[PDB]
Amino acid sequence: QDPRKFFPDNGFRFFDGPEDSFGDGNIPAQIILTLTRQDEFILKQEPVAAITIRTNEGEMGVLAGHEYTVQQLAPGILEVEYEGGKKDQYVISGGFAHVNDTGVVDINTVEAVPLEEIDHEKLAKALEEARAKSQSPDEAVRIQGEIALEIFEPLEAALH
Amino acid sequence: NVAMDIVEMLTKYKELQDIIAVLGIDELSEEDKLIVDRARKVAKFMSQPFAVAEVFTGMKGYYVQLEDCVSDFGSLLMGQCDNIPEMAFYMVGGLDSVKEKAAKMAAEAAAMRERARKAAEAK
Amino acid sequence: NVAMDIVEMLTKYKELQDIIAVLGIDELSEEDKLIVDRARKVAKFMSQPFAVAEVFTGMKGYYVQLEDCVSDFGSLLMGQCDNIPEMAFYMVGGLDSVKEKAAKMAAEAAAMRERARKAAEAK
Amino acid sequence: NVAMDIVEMLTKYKELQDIIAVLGIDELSEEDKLIVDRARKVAKFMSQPFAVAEVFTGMKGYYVQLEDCVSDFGSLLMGQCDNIPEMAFYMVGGLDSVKEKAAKMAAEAAAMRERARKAAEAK
Amino acid sequence: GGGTIRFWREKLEGYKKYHQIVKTIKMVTLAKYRQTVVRTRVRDQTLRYTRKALDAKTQDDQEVIEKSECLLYVPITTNRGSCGALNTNMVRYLQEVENPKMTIISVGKKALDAMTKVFQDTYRRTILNDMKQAMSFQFAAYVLEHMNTVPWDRAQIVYNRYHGAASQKLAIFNLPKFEDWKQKLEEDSAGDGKIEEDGLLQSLPMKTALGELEETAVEDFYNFHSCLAVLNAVSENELSEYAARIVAVENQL
Amino acid sequence: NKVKVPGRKPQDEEDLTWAEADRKLTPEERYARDKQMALLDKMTSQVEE
Amino acid sequence: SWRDAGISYLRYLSIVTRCIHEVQKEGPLLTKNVRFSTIGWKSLYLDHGATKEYTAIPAELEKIPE
Amino acid sequence: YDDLSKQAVSYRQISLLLRRPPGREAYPGDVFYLHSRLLERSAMMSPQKGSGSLTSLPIVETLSNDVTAYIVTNVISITDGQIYLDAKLFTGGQRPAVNIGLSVSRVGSSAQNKAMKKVGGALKMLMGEYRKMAGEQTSGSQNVSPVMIRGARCLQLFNQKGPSYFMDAIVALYAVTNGYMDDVKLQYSKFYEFLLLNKDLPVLYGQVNNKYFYMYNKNLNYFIRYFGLNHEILEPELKKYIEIHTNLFLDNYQSRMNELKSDEDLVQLKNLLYACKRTV
Amino acid sequence: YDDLSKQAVSYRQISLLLRRPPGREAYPGDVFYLHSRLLERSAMMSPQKGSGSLTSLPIVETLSNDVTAYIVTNVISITDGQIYLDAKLFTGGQRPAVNIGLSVSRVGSSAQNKAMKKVGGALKMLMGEYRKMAGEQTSG
């Protein structure tokens, strides 16, 4: 028998993660954002002035040199603000935001769609369905309607 | 019985050659590729050097005895020798010579690996 | 029209043995599998036991009238009999005998199933 | 030497045309796309008109000498004539004539630009 | 002599029909590959904090076997053949690594007939995605829900990495266990930041901030990143299948 | 432990195949038998129902 | 809420994703995204010679493993 | 008649040396009339002529399994049936190497006997069903159909070297078609038959309830040959012999066989199975 | 002519019975010249000759779609085009069961009318691509 003909590579090594820094003494002027849905990015290390995330504890706002914090993303909207003053809103389905002191943001999600790709007419129909599903006494339907309403209520609040 | 089983194995190998030449060995069932590796070992083992062909084969000629020929083919038939590579059976006589050739080849392959390590370190 | 449609189906049947031999049945459309099964039923259905072939078949012959010979092939041509199995068409006459043979084969299949149940009950 | 280099270029262009239909032109390296453009220019340059058909198709014919063709293909192989587009080489004879066609094409494009710009500016 | 020439003519027609059929397979696979190559521009960015969380120094096997009780190896195989040596090399790696404490939950039909004839008892089952609808985060959730049937101490997700159209190599994700990952997180959050392996990144601030994170959220962090790892593996093997099939079809032609 | 290859010898597994039968038509026969068994089982249920 | 009902975080994410896929407009992006929520996969395991489904972990999201 | 192709080479020599014109493949042309005159003398004579008969079993060599040569076609046109022997099956292990797809008989049931008619009517159907499946590598090892089992066991029984008595064949094929030899594996299909024909297990193990049916007498053949096994008197005794034979086999011999792991005992058993293929 | 293959068999009989020297497939050598004596009489005559014309549609039966035979190879060598029918298409409802890839008319458009040239050029550019597309697409 051949002595270990195979020697597979570790796939983690094919990615390039940031290296965290202690005591660097320099504050970044603008963050380096990286948003990813299921596998594909929509933004790769873009310069960004500011960003605004939603969580279960509440809505947070991140700027350059924000403290290292890792935390959930509650299912809602996500605002990016470039140096030019414009903005870009994205609806998400959960995730984890990884902030850096050096100025790097990895918002890894399961979905990321702009609000422009959503219509209020189609949303209004789903609302009463999720609501009446929450009314039906049954654990299989109540939780599903609760989750659907949880994602829809911020949309109904933001489109207005 | 050993001869009839060898002939049956080679018959199946001939039928499988029609697929191997077209698609590849990977598209065969595990049983079929084992049968292929075994029949390839049998065919390679059937070759042996002769004293007359020393000019060509570049090897001393062997005189494989009848009694030792059956035990070798039977061991190759019962799966008693599958860890040996295929090229060890090429141009040899007797399973003892096959094991000697396998030892030589393993030693040479290892030595090539340590040589490549030394070259890479010096590189 | 029925004859020409059957002849048009069997050519595609040839073109699809050309493919199923390589790919498999999975890589064809359901509209294609439908005509495959229909042609596979037609080919077996156009078999016929003869009275002269009692020695070889061991089964009495059938005299199939031309009018019934068109109603049955057309019913099979337009999917009117697709629930019926394939082998029920093998070596019979008209369509009535086909349904008889299907009922038979279902009876013996249920017999084997319940006998397997009773064999598991016994041991 | 020039002919063998052109044959090598065309063989490579065939190998790469067996890739562009697979992947796409961007998949190739910066060297390969250069020889792709040069081979397309060569193939268009082989297209030669004929004085025989001058009455039928209207275009003139060109009797190109031997050494001049060698200098032309060597310039096209050395890359010292690459700024010239591909379509200029189509149906011409000699490097001293494709330049006339290229000047005509550039002047015609400049005339279309002058026409369109003034037509849009007048309104 | 008429039978011989008729036989050769029939074999000629058979080879021609076989050729155009294989050509059709090549066209279909080309369409799928030209779709999936759009991922190649966009990959290599989502797993970087997952690396930072789950990655560890190269641990030798023979210590991992003695440390552990029931490992797990998830080979991601294909649904249909004419791929090449991907499935065979996966099986070869696992029978190279075969040890008394293993368990194999695979992904694909070709892991069903092969492994069961090589690995009798360790092989358990497989998972099948009929690729009419592209893979999803919930497909990897299904795979995690299947892996979690075991109280596994380490999960080696094997897959094929698409380095190029002529390069589809092997790759592994060595996932720890949750309780062990948490304990290592604490033990590495206490001490200072010192890398013990070249190419590895320091993540002490992350391993503190996760300590700031509550328990259920840390379990969700683990499961989410393991799901992303599984998903990247499935996507890379999909692309590697569709890329190696072209090579293993042009050689057939 | 490696593989239970079939063969003529008792330690080996059953070789139910026949060299006379062709392999070209095998997939069509497999599909036909599967479809026929499904139809027969459905007829069993339909007769009881 | 859904936490003690037994369904995991990831099924919750997938359900929210399915909802986002429902509401969004008709377009190429919806054509790309419906693929990332639809359920087509299975499990299977080999018997002595035959296939069998392992239906203990369902694909449909409303259900709960056991 | 041993090789008639040689009988035709001699006629070709005689003709061409006598300055007769050649023909297809150099033969004079009237080489068909030769074999016609020879083989049409085979007949089953009328009772007016004594009810006599003579069978003819001509032998013809074949080159690369071609049936396109002139003499082979000329003779197949004459002879009723043919027994095609294929090198691929001879070399493929099985002996005699008959190919049923290419070998036929244009007499059929009328030639064979009452007891053999029913068995052949079953075996033809079983082989027609088994030809369609046998190309499949057995994957449903427990989900295999009965036909895939019985056909393989029958092919094992077809392996011979010498002839077989009628009584020593109908019983062996009956056990296959009726499925009594379905639990034992394929390799032991002939050792079973050897015990079924030369080592009576129920008479040995004391399970003797049958009044008469035992495979030691050799004279029961003339009752099977007249009444048939599908009769009121031989069928139940046949079943109450074969079932106990299968039970005693599966208990004592099959169990001991599968317990072998040593290479020496395994080879001893292997040689025994081949010997049973030969003698039976 | 329905058909010239049988004319060739008749010539072969006449020759062999009269002990003319044989040749390929027991045909004499000048059997080609026979069909050339015939088919060359077909012609579009000059305006000095009344502008008459004689067209020919010689039929030749193939066997197992053989075209390498002697009479077929001769008539193809003679004719100003050819038509090739196929049984696989005749059974598949395509009647006439032509094979456009093998069917050829060296008189491509000079025979066609003013209204027909445009339509035929369009149909050629359509069928040449339909063949490439249908040959590579699946059955499904």
Residue numbers in the entry:
A (entry chain H): 17 to 176
B (entry chain D), C (entry chain E), D (entry chain F): 379 to 501
E (entry chain G): 3 to 255
F (entry chain N): 20 to 68
G (entry chain I): 2 to 67
H (entry chain A): 283 to 562
I (entry chain B): 283 to 422
Task: Give sentences from the paper.
Subsequent focused classification of the IF1 binding site suggested complete inhibitor binding for rotational states 1 and 2, whereas rotational state 3 displayed a mixed occupancy, with a minority (34%) of particles containing IF1 and a majority (66%) not containing the inhibitor. Rather than reflecting dwell times during rotary catalysis, the distribution of rotational states is likely dictated by accessibility of the respective catalytic interfaces to IF1 binding, which for rotational state-3 may be sterically hindered by the proximity to the peripheral stalk. We observe this contact in all three rotational states, which provides the first observation of an interaction between the peripheral and central stalk in the ATP synthase. The position of the lumenal H5EG1 on the c-ring β-barrel remains largely unchanged in all three rotational states, suggesting a mechanism of transient rotor-stator interaction during c-ring rotation.
The mitochondrial ATP synthase is a membrane protein complex that generates most of the ATP in eukaryotic cells. The translocation of protons through the membrane-bound Fo part, mediated by subunit a, drives the rotation of a membrane-embedded c-ring and the attached central stalk, which together form the rotor.
